[PDB]
Amino acid sequence: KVFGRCELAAAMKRHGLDNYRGYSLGNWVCAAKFESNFNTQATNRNTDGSTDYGILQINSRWWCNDGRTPGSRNLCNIPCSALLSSDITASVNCAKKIVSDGNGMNAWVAWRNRCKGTDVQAWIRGCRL
């Protein structure tokens, strides 16, 4: 499923992500734009055999089990295919675990490179929330 900006903003807000561990909603919508371009099915097959899965491109070496990643851990206790569904819940629940462990939203390179330090409010422009 591909989400539009406001549709995803709304769904993320429904899932309690606004101000989660100090990160306002615009951060999460900015991170999903540059990680996956709002696509729940995006996958990026990496160098040491891990793959990033879903709207928020969560990595299989530490967070989910896909059965083929070299020294993998399954900290969110899920199959990586749960992160590829049209409904965002397994991705937001694993993302809340990531931000609570590894240094806030720095875990997402696209947030850290493209969103960090900009005015993220813009990403909720025009969405009545």
Swiss-Prot record:
Keywords: Allergen, Antimicrobial, Bacteriolytic enzyme, Disulfide bond, Glycosidase, Hydrolase, Secreted, Signal
Positions bound to substrate: D101
Limits of the C-type lysozyme domain: 1-129
Transmembrane segments: none
Class of enzymatic activity (EC top level): hydrolase
Biological-process GO terms, alphabetical: cell wall macromolecule catabolic process; defense response to bacterium; defense response to Gram-negative bacterium; defense response to Gram-positive bacterium; killing of cells of another organism
EC number: 3.2.1.17
Tissue: In the egg white and polymorphonuclear leukocytes.
Active site location: E35, D52
Gene3D superfamilies cross-referenced by the UniProt entry: 1.10.530.10
Compartment(s): Secreted
Catalytic activity: Hydrolysis of (1->4)-beta-linkages between N-acetylmuramic acid and N-acetyl-D-glucosamine residues in a peptidoglycan and between N-acetyl-D-glucosamine residues in chitodextrins
One GO MF term: lysozyme activity
Xref: SMART domains: LYZ1 (SM00263)
Primary location: secreted
Annotated disulfide bonds: C6-C127, C30-C115, C64-C80, C76-C94
The keyword Cell division is annotated on this UniProt entry: no
Pfam families listed in its UniProt record: Lys
GO CC field: cytoplasm; endoplasmic reticulum; extracellular space
Additional facts recorded: Lysozyme C is capable of both hydrolysis and transglycosylation; it also shows a slight esterase activity. It acts rapidly on both peptide-substituted and unsubstituted peptidoglycan, and slowly on chitin oligosaccharides.
Subunit: Monomer.
Protein task: Lysozymes have primarily a bacteriolytic function; those in tissues and body fluids are associated with the monocyte-macrophage system and enhance the activity of immunoagents. Has bacteriolytic activity against M.luteus.
Sequence similarity: Belongs to the glycosyl hydrolase 22 family.
PANTHER family: LYSOZYME C
Protein name, per record: Lysozyme C
Source organism of the structure: Gallus gallus
